Amino acid sequence: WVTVYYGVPVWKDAETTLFCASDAEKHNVWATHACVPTDPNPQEIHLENVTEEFNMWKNNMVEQMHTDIISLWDQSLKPCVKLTPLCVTLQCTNVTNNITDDMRGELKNCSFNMTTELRDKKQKVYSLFYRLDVVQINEKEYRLINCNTSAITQACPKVSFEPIPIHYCAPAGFAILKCKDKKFNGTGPCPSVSTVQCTHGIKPVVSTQLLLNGSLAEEEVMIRSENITNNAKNILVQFNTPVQINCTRPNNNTRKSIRIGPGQAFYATGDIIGDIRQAHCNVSKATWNETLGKVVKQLRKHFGNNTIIRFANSSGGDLEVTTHSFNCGGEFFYCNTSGLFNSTWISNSITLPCRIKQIINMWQRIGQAMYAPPIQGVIRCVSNITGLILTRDGGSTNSTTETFRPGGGDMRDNWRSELYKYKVVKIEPLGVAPTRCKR
Amino acid sequence: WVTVYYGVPVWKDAETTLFCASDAEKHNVWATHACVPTDPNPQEIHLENVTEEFNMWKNNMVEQMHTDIISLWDQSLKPCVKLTPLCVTLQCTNVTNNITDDMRGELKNCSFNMTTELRDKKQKVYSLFYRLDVVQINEKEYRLINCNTSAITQACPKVSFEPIPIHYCAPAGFAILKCKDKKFNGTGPCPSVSTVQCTHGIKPVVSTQLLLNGSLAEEEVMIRSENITNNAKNILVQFNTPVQINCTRPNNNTRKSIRIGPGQAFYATGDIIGDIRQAHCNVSKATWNETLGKVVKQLRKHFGNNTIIRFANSSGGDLEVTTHSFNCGGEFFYCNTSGLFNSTWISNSITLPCRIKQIINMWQRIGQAMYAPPIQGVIRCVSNITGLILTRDGGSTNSTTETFRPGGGDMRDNWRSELYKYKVVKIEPLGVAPTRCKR
Amino acid sequence: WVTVYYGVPVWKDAETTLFCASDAEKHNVWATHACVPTDPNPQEIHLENVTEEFNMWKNNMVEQMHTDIISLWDQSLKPCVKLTPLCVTLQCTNVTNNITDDMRGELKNCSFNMTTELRDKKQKVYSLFYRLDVVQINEKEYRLINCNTSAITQACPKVSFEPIPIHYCAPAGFAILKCKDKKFNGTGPCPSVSTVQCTHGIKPVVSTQLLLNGSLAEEEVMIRSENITNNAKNILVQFNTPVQINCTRPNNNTRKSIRIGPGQAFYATGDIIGDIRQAHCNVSKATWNETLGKVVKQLRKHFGNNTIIRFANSSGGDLEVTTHSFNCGGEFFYCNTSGLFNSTWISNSITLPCRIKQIINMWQRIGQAMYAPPIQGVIRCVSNITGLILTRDGGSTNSTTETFRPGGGDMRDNWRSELYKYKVVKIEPLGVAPTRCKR
Amino acid sequence: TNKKECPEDYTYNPRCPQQYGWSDCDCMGDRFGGYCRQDGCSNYIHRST
Amino acid sequence: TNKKECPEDYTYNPRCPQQYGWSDCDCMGDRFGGYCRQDGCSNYIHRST
Amino acid sequence: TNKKECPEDYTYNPRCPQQYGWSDCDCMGDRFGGYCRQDGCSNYIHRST
Amino acid sequence: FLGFLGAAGSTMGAASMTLTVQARNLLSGIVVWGIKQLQARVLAVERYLRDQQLLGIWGCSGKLICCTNVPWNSSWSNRNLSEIWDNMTWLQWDKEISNYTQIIYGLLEESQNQQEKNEQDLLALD
Amino acid sequence: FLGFLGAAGSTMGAASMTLTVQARNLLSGIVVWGIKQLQARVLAVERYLRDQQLLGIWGCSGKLICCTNVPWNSSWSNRNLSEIWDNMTWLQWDKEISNYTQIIYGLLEESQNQQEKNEQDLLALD
Amino acid sequence: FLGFLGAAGSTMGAASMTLTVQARNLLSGIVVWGIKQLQARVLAVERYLRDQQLLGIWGCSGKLICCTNVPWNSSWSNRNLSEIWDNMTWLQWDKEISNYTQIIYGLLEESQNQQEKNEQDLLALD
Ligand SMILES: *[C@@H]1O[C@H](CO)[C@@H](O[C@@H]2O[C@H](CO)[C@@H](O[C@@H]3O[C@H](CO[C@H]4O[C@H](CO)[C@@H](O)[C@H](O)[C@@H]4O)[C@@H](O)[C@H](O)[C@@H]3O)[C@H](O)[C@H]2NC(C)=O)[C@H](O)[C@H]1NC(C)=O
Ligand SMILES: *[C@@H]1O[C@H](CO)[C@@H](O[C@@H]2O[C@H](CO)[C@@H](O[C@@H]3O[C@H](CO[C@H]4O[C@H](CO)[C@@H](O)[C@H](O)[C@@H]4O)[C@@H](O)[C@H](O)[C@@H]3O)[C@H](O)[C@H]2NC(C)=O)[C@H](O)[C@H]1NC(C)=O
Ligand SMILES: *[C@@H]1O[C@H](CO)[C@@H](O[C@@H]2O[C@H](CO)[C@@H](O[C@@H]3O[C@H](CO[C@H]4O[C@H](CO)[C@@H](O)[C@H](O)[C@@H]4O)[C@@H](O)[C@H](O)[C@@H]3O)[C@H](O)[C@H]2NC(C)=O)[C@H](O)[C@H]1NC(C)=O
Ligand SMILES: *[C@@H]1O[C@H](CO)[C@@H](O[C@@H]2O[C@H](CO)[C@@H](O)[C@H](O)[C@H]2NC(C)=O)[C@H](O)[C@H]1NC(C)=O
Ligand SMILES: *[C@@H]1O[C@H](CO)[C@@H](O[C@@H]2O[C@H](CO)[C@@H](O)[C@H](O)[C@H]2NC(C)=O)[C@H](O)[C@H]1NC(C)=O
């Protein structure tokens, strides 16, 4: 006989829209005024005698993460002042005198013919720029480098990009399953199932090459990829130990505002107090030494057990992916990581120089260049590397040596590196089973 | 005794909001990214032993159609570049040399003082225009003709206006009833009832005088009007046969872009390869001959069985309604249809010259002029006339002869010409009836 | 035994979002196109044998009122023309000849270099201004006074600010309770409970010092405050009688438009027909005399039964709060009320001169200055004072005499003066009680 | 008393007689969507005040 | 230790003493909605650090 | 017949060979997010038409 | 089989009494541009729920057909049961008895209220 | 008649037991600027449905008054039934027993679960 | 206690039959940037209501477990009741019988329709 049952703890794979939550103000671009409070208490339930199949490469949570971040980023500039009036010919020379050699040619001192709130007279102003945002017009005369591509908007100096963690939460009828497994590498079944209302919080840190401020593996370095033999895919390496980096922006800046119009002002670099120094990051050398060895052992286990592995720096190309990129204090840093990838592991302090830019085309879109206003004073940043984005050279069958390089570019992979622990399912509580009972 | 019943297949006339659907991209202005998929299969159910009353002149589906189209049209320009910087004095002369007489005076060759992304220097540029968009300033010196009325926006050359059909669908609790009748003329009962979840797709083709790319009558030409004796109402004539028209824009155009600003460029007509010819449409003559006769017979049946009917061309007035208007390839055409309405039917190839415009105030609104960018190459359009919009002259009691002219203006009537087949009803499933049963 | 009951008429204090409603067009900024119809009939139900506790100082209805008004105000300018092109140096002199002494120095006659729809030539125009909106630039040369703070937008001369009353309505599951009590003074229990679906309509009149166009107390003047001994709080005085004021703007104005751009025009004061007179308000003297005495008696009852009370005019400071402010006909008036607060009440016609401004920063926000276009002709306004906003001087322990001054500034208090009659509750229909019955 | 009202199915449109120089054209047929046409012209409803 | 905090029902508003030249007016009464008035003026809560 | 299609995991990006002067770089690895890199370069799928 | 309104022409005795009413007419009842889409979903939900609440208050939830103890008032319509059920349909029927809908709803509510009251008294005395 | 909260002052024995609870208190329960309007509709729907689901889990759907087999715990409130029902009202009542609401809900759920379980055993052995 | 899906590993005979199904699996079922938030609420409502309407049409509303008079078809799955209920769980079970879901739903609807029809005939002849 047929008996109908309701409330059955059964589910199917599903794709739905998740809620964002934080902190169980108008500050902070990453939805702090928009997301709801997190649940004040973890609701995690371990499920015994069950298994589940995960595939981090087919997940949709990452698409939402992507969508949400791009959207929030765009919203943050909507009410902000456009810098259209600023793209003018710059009369410009080099910053000099106080440059400690390393920065020679990096800073520009340019003059402008700017508008005033009265639409008639102009003001003669000048400000300082990084050379990376300035290009010569006639092969002196300079222009903002992104002027001839698309519109530039000044970020409102009310907010910053501090990566406050966001928890994702299921709507009623949905649940998020998590593995508590240690061997699971992103695909297939794991003998570990635990259900939660929400994920832990994930910090939306945007970077290339080195994954920063994330979670760590507990027992072993975990290396994950979609296809171990596909050199067109990246590799996610999750460290089981942190690697600390001490970064600095060693310039005591003074910022000034220039009134542009009726309620508009431009935030200009004024000058530098004291001398001028190159930005840099100090990586613990000993830690890197050991960390790399651990990574190599794990790479060898997947392939190359009897071969050797070399690391090399990045390929020529766009700065955004050829160097390490991060944001700190709201400032945009570009760092030369070649000092980290210059070795061969055959078994048997590091200072990285950096560059700074003020015009950022985050996410490569047209009409969305963002101008990062100066930050006064000196910036220090401390964080740990929790993992790597690696690529492997192809073009060779000589298995004796494999070559790896730091990668990054598609931000989806950084999010995947945290989201992989979770799967979204939909509950289907209504069903039947045979019995010996009849109405 | 009273017995309560639920799920009764009963309904009332109702007005609700319908869903749009298509194709069971970011291209196409008419909601292709916004509408939902259509149902993959027709759900039509014929209802036996029932009749229903329809009134196409009191329908609300048309208001939604109107609302949706205007809204979609406006949305399509929201992210597009404004042409404000372009309304400057034009230094302008005539295009000459290669004009094959017919086009003399139609094209202008004008020079401009335009901005550049650098807000200081200007560029000297020139481009070609149709005379209909250009007016003399001082009674040489010219201006964009719509400059002194309202803002002009350039359509983004990413999209076009291709009339991809849209199906309208009922929300749960609603249904759409359709007549399968052949004699029904828009009002009153029809002995034919069929219920659907959704309407067939309707192509949002916007035109005057001749109804294009629509459905055909199956047995007879159907002539419908709200009031057969009211000369202030239009007449919808639905052909039971197509009339093909071959239209062309016989000019091999070259388009060029002019950079205007930081992420903005104007699409200008560059020049014409080969000689310059007037745009035109070729109407099958024989078909028109027979088609008109059929229309007249049906008009005679409504009135004038013993009288004669003459056709005449349009009255003086606004181009938008005095000529035939259509869009094809994204281009805006104005055609002289007087060659189609120059006859008397007493019982007992046609070439239409055309004009082209680039500034279109679609729907007659202020601040919404749209600039249609040039299309390169040569355009051919093939379509059939499925019906007519006619008006009848008043001012006379001499029944001997009636006079008809092509009309059009209020777009609601074009939509009505397709929507008339359908009615929206709301289901009211709960009710009572007498029985011999008691709880 | 436990018995479960549903539909219990029980409730808790609650905060929810209320619906706005009016009139059981595109004109009128205060949501007339946005709010729903009011219920055509009062649904008030008196509840016998019940009491309820109210606290007008902890109410949330006022926050919604605040939020809604600010939002509607902002929405009204969204589609309107910006006046950015207008902030130019003004070449300016005094209006003279026809000034009847009182207005000397109040009106300015200024010349401008304005744009035209053709972006090349400029037009020489001039217009008249109130001095309060114009400031000298160089200590002749003048500027719009708010130019150097923030953007100014012209209100669209399609709408006005007429305070059409809005009713607030509960969502299902909510109800609004009202006191019909006469002694209740904003806090504590009242032995009067009546439940409604919606509140009566409240006119969103914005003013300082004198509360206009509101409801009246029925039996006594009611004086309400959050804390009777806190001199940092305001005092709301609700009259039981109206005091009529006849205000005028005694200048027969002519308005002219200046075309600014492609679909933009500025509405300028043209000139004054006849002579030039100062704006003013005529307050019934006898009524004020008696009204004040009633207010004083009630103040004495709260404190000062054996002391005397004096009234004094406002303190130095921002015009917006040092004078009486109101809008009428869409015009913005500033009136000198010192003639109303110049007396001591020891127990045992009035003409107020006024000023007019065209740039209003309503709600003190940046980038939201509104330009009030001129109104042609002569304006008369008639309304009654229904109450006062008073403050009491501190700094003294000499109880012999208390000093009061007119106040106003935070608009929340004006709304509170009407909203205080109501409380929002949520219904919780499900609960249990002991019985002698078992399933 | 009365007002210069247009007949049903016509509305008032001052643009047409001014733009075109058309006599006895105060009102324009609604059937043309706000556009001006000579055959869409009408004067006001013919009644005195 | 302490901070230059305003008393309840007053907030900090640097605009007022600067715009008007008012002594002992660091804080402004909340009762005036952010607008400046002499009788709305206050100094900070009187406590040492 | 055939088309100049990119191999899976690469897309077409004309910017890269033009911006950099890179030979045999018509397609760019998707793994780099649209950004240009020498090691992300590829030619088209090697088949004739 | 017959479709959502398929049974409409079969007169009441077959039009709904074949449980066509459940099979489709009821089953289908609840089956920034895109604002309209939420409005449609919400309104459909509200209508569904109003019907269920009415059945609930009348003691008719969980039923396609629900008999009560209220006598039919012939004053609203006087016809033989055989014509009412076999030759007339539901749409025609509503045209004849729509004006008495509110009267009957009030009667249904009061009857159910009294029926429950009586059961409550019986439990108290049990 | 009495209105939505009209019966509130009539003490429980008349305030709800006259089925005023159904007639209005329950009947009314479920009866880009305009975002608020959808939020209000949705929230009203959610509250209605939560009440119904609770009645459902307790085996009390389709009832205005639902007796269970759970004894009253006097430890939550010890009063005579005549005062409880005739002189005290529902608002006053909740003030006295609100703190035991969750205890009773848990008890109601378990009892219903056991009752259904017993019926399931009876069918199996039938 | 066990949590929302806590009973999933306990095989059907304990996984749902302990009324864990009600206590949490069912109880939790219905428990311009922020557009997503309304969409989520609405969709949750729709799913809840679809389940209830199905239980309604089958005559199983107000029940956690509902027996019908439809025989089990072994053609869909032939196993002993003791293994079905004691060693296999609900997820495993659905994997085996998912393909027959629609067949059974149709059968359930027809049976309920006939059962009600028979009751209607009995009242008419009473
Ligand atoms: C990885 O996690 C780390 C742990 O939190 C992150 O370190 C934190 O990084 C911030 C800088 O990005 C550090 O500095 C803070 O800066 C604010 C300054 O803003 C305020 O003051 C300025 C002054 O003009 C004003 O303009 C602003 O509007 C604000 O008002 C200080 O207020 C804080 O006290 C602090 O100095 C944190 O110190 C630092 N945390 C720790 C524990 O060191 C790290 O950045 C993360 N990694 C990445 C890449 O973000
Ligand atoms: C009535 O129905 C007819 C049947 O479909 C419609 O005919 C179709 O009309 C279109 C033109 O409007 C014809 O031409 C097509 O044009 C596109 C060109 O766009 C793409 O390429 C350009 C090149 O620069 C690029 O700029 C665009 O962004 C696009 O990438 C071609 O790709 C198509 O192959 C085709 O040529 C259709 O051929 C024509 N269909 C038929 C069957 O002839 C007719 O227009 C309808 N009536 C009306 C008034 O629209
Ligand atoms: C307190 O309640 C009083 C009672 O209603 C309010 O009095 C009303 O105030 C309005 C003015 O604000 C009076 O005048 C009306 O003005 C309109 C003019 O607008 C139309 O015409 C102009 C002409 O160019 C056009 O530009 C506009 O777009 C409109 O087309 C007239 O049409 C009305 O007939 C009337 O004259 C009312 O007369 C007056 N009511 C009474 C009964 O006197 C009072 O304002 C309220 N208090 C406050 C502070 O608002
Ligand atoms: C990444 O490695 C390559 C090779 O190790 C570096 O290539 C050098 O680029 C500079 C640029 O002017 C040349 O002068 C050198 O001759 C290049 N080296 C070789 C061997 O050709 C590249 O610069 C490295 N990138 C970083 C950030 O170190
Ligand atoms: C409010 O009252 C004060 C005092 O009664 C007025 O202060 C006067 O301000 C004018 C401004 O130039 C001075 O010339 C007078 O000497 C001031 N009076 C005193 C006594 O100092 C103030 O103007 C009043 N405000 C209004 C609107 O009347």
Numbering used by the authors:
A (entry chain E), B (entry chain A), C (entry chain C): 35 to 58, 64 to 141, 150 to 186, 189 to 309, 312 to 323, 323A, 324 to 398, 413 to 503
D (entry chain G), E (entry chain H), F (entry chain I): 99 to 147
G (entry chain B), H (entry chain D), I (entry chain F): 519 to 541, 560 to 567, 570 to 664
Article passage:
Here, by x-ray crystallography, cryo–electron microscopy, and site-directed mutagenesis, we structurally and functionally elucidate the mode of binding of a potent bnAb (NC-Cow1) elicited in cows by immunization with the HIV envelope (Env) trimer BG505 SOSIP. The exceptionally long (60 residues) third complementarity-determining region of the heavy chain (CDR H3) of NC-Cow1 forms a mini domain (knob) on an extended stalk that navigates through the dense glycan shield on Env to target a small footprint on the gp120 CD4 receptor binding site with no contact of the other CDRs to the rest of the Env trimer. The HIV-1 envelope (Env) protein is a heavily glycosylated trimer consisting of heterodimeric gp120 and gp41. The most broadly neutralizing bnAb isolated from these sera, NC-Cow1, had 72% neutralization breadth on a 117-virus panel, with a half-maximal inhibitory concentration (IC50) of 0.028 μg/ml.
The crystal and cryo-EM structures of NC-Cow1 with BG505 SOSIP.664 reveal very similar binding interactions with the distal surface of the knob domain contacting the gp120 CD4bs. Loops 1 (D9-D22) and 2 (D26-D36) form a jaw-like structure that interacts with the gp120 CD4 binding loop (CD4BL). The glycan at gp120 Asn197 is visualized in both the cryo-EM and crystal structures, albeit with a slightly different conformation, and contacts knob GlnD15 and TyrD16 with 115 Å2 of buried glycan molecular surface in the crystal structure and 150 Å2 in the cryo-EM structure. Other minor differences between the crystal and cryo-EM structures occur in loops around gp120 residues 364 to 371, 426 to 432, and 459 to 467; however, these differences are likely related to the low resolution of the structure. NC-Cow1 Fab makes two interactions that mimic CD4 receptor binding. TyrD31 inserts into the gp120 CD4 Phe43 binding pocket, and ArgD11 makes a salt bridge with gp120 Asp368 that emulates the CD4 Arg59 to gp120 Asp368 interaction. NC-Cow1 paratope residues include GluD4, AspD5, TyrD6, AsnD9, ArgD11, GlnD14, GlnD15, TyrD16, TrpD18, ArgD27, PheD28, TyrD31, ArgD33, AspD35, and the disulfide between CysD12 and CysD32. PheD28 at the paratope geometric center is buried in a shallow pocket and flanked by ArgD27 and ArgD33, while the paratope perimeter is composed largely of charged and polar residues including many Asp, Asn, Glu, and Gln.
